[PDB]
């Protein structure tokens, strides 16, 4: 996370590392929407242009970690998946519209002090919190810079990182990239001269962009880290999958499994 900081232990109980079997490496990040389900960004698993089509027989989900690498003996609750659902109208070829995907954990997680679910937003909660200016929290295990020299100031973070980024006006996002922007993707980041920097980066794709409610005190997840033009780049902003728009889907997916 560019210009972010070390996150307090247990600060993000919904964080879900998305691990890769062989090599044992880090592929993405994601939120735990319920002991059963995991919510991540579609392009994390499917993006042909980069030889990227991951099947359930490759992904491991280490949940509730904090350090990026070191195995946390009785805290992280590793897990394998069962089903992978990506949005049918996933436009990877053009501008990654609906970069959302659901991962069905095989065995419902044993909820605990470090493993705890967020709350998907609903009209009420959404309407009040989704106004430009309002900040948000992006947390992931990504690199600290876009490019660098001889690992200066160390690029890859020791533990989970955090950064509260304010949402920007849509007209500003639209006007900052040649790329097509849809209504299923808001953007957030500081404006030039604003003083504060900070933005997700390679390794945070899937990370939950959450926002705490000032009413019912619940931490909601509003966007999934989706795409971006470089990291921390002045004049550029990060695009987050708009969860709420896709809420209807999330439901459609889960309810079909049974009851």
């Amino acid at each position: 996370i560019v210009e972010g900081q070390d996150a307090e232990v247990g600060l993000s109980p919904w964080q879900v590392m998305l691990f890769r079997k062989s090599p044992q490496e880090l592929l993405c990040g994601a939120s735990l929407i319920s002991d059963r389900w995991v919510l991540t960004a579609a392009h994390c698993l499917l993006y042909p242009p980069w030889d990227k089509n991951f099947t359930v027989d490759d992904l491991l989900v280490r949940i509730g970690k904090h350090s990026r690498t070191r195995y946390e003996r009785k805290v992280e609750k590793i897990s394998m998946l069962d089903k992978i659902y990506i949005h049918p109208r996933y436009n990877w070829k053009e501008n990654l519209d609906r970069d959302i995907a659901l991962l069905k954990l095989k065995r419902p997680i044993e909820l605990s002090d470090y493993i705890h679910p967020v709350c998907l937003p609903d009209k009420q909660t959404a309407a009040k919190l989704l106004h430009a200016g309002f900040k948000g929290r992006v947390t992931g295990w990504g690199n600290r810079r876009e490019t660098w020299t001889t690992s200066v100031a160390e690029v890859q973070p020791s533990v989970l990182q955090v950064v509260n980024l304010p949402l920007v006006e849509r007209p500003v996002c639209k006007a900052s990239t040649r790329i097509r922007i849809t209504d299923n993707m808001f953007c957030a980041g500081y404006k030039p001269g604003e003083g504060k920097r900070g933005d997700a980066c390679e390794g945070d794709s899937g990370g939950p962009f959450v926002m705490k409610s000032p009413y019912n005190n619940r931490w909601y997840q509003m966007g999934i880290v989706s795409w971006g033009e470089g990291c921390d780049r002045d004049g550029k902003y990060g695009f987050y999958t708009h969860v709420f728009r896709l809420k209807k889907w999330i439901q459609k997916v889960i309810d079909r499994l049974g009851s």
Binding site: V9, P117, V118, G133, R137, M211, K212, P214
Partner: peptide, 28 residues
């Protein structure tokens, strides 16, 4: 609880450093 409530914080009634920022930004 039913969702979005951190044991080690909201439950315990303790706030994390960077939490106050999110609130100040709600000036609207």
């Amino acid at each position: 609880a039913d969702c979005g409530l951190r044991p080690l914080f909201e439950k315990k009634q303790v706030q994390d450093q960077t939490e106050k920022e999110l609130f100040e930004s709600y000036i609207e």
